[PDB]
Design a protein around this ligand. Structure first.
Ligand SMILES: COc1cc(-c2cnc(N)c(-c3ccc(C(=O)O)cc3)n2)cc(OC)c1OC
Ligand SMILES: [Cl-]
Ligand SMILES: [Cl-]
Ligand SMILES: [Cl-]
Length: 251
């Protein structure tokens, strides 16, 4: 479809993401705008293929990407996707830090269950961090968004030695994300990357807060094992007695 099919309501975050309304039925959506005006033919060809793959991902726990619009006037590409009224997990963690208020174990179990399912789908088809995890209005958790200055808090031991495909590296990142949801801080912190790497290598961290059960602590701790082969698989995580039907997605 074309941009005129939609009305911009307002900007959510600055490419730039905006909440929009589809005129045909008034459906509330979001689009992300990419300015391809400075791109080469080679970069546009890569872009096209990536957007195409994006359109093929249909999963309850992956942000749904509906359409792509070209506006040759502004040299802008619009990627239309579902609206997640709950925002991102980064804002939830920030909210708790400042409220001196930990999140319910039930919420952490929802995020664990639903993100593990998202990872399972990604692995089948073959950037896990709080700002890339979105919440809808029905308690559902969705993975979205498929270089310097930033601190690589979630970088796994093996990935810091040599960046290569390893599904157990994703489990480490999930571990880090769940840890942060509980403790409201990442398991490893430092002011420099050299110091960070030394800590990650040592593999030691504080227990998550005592309000969280030993069982939750145990599985998060297993995900943060220094040995990739000691971390639980997606299958092993979902077998955990903590995970129940109600922690999964519901339309
Ligand atoms: C980054 O902060 C926020 C993001 C959103 C939001 C809602 N729906 C969405 N589909 C998205 C979203 C935006 C971009 C991407 C992506 O680049 O793939 C994936 C998801 N963000 C909503 C927000 O509040 C309504 C919000 O503020 C906390
Ligand atoms: Cl606190
Ligand atoms: Cl919450
Ligand atoms: Cl759903």
């Amino acid at each position: 479809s074309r941009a005129e099919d939609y009305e911009v309501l307002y900007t959510i975050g600055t490419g730039r993401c905006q909440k929009i309304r589809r005129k045909s039925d008034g459906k509330i959506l979001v689009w992300k705008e990419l300015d391809y005006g400075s791109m080469t033919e080679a970069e546009k060809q890569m872009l096209v293929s990536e957007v195409n793959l994006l359109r093929e991902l249909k999963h309850p726990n992956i942000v749904r990407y509906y359409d792509r619009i070209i506006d040759r006037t502004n040299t802008t590409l619009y990627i239309v996707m579902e609206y997640c009224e709950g925002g991102d997990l980064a804002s939830v963690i920030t909210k708790g830090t400042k409220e001196r208020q930990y999140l319910d174990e039930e919420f952490v179990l929802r995020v664990m269950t639903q993100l593990t399912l998202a990872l399972k789908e990604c692995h089948r088809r073959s950037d896990l961090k709080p700002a890339n995890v979105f919440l809808d209005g029905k308690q559902n958790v969705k993975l979205g968004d498929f270089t310097f200055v930033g601190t690589p808090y979630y970088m796994s031991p093996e990935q810091m030695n040599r960046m290569s495909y390893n599904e157990k590296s994703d489990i480490w990142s999930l571990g880090c994300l769940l840890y942060e949801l509980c403790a409201l801080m990442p398991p490893f912190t430092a002011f420099s990357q050299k110091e960070l790497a030394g800590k990650i290598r040592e593999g030691k961290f504080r227990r998550i807060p005592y309000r969280y059960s030993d069982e939750l602590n145990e599985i998060i701790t297993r995900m943060l094992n220094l040995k990739d082969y000691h971390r639980p698989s997606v299958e092993e995580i979902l077998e955990n007695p903590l995970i129940l039907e109600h922690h999964h997605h519901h339309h």
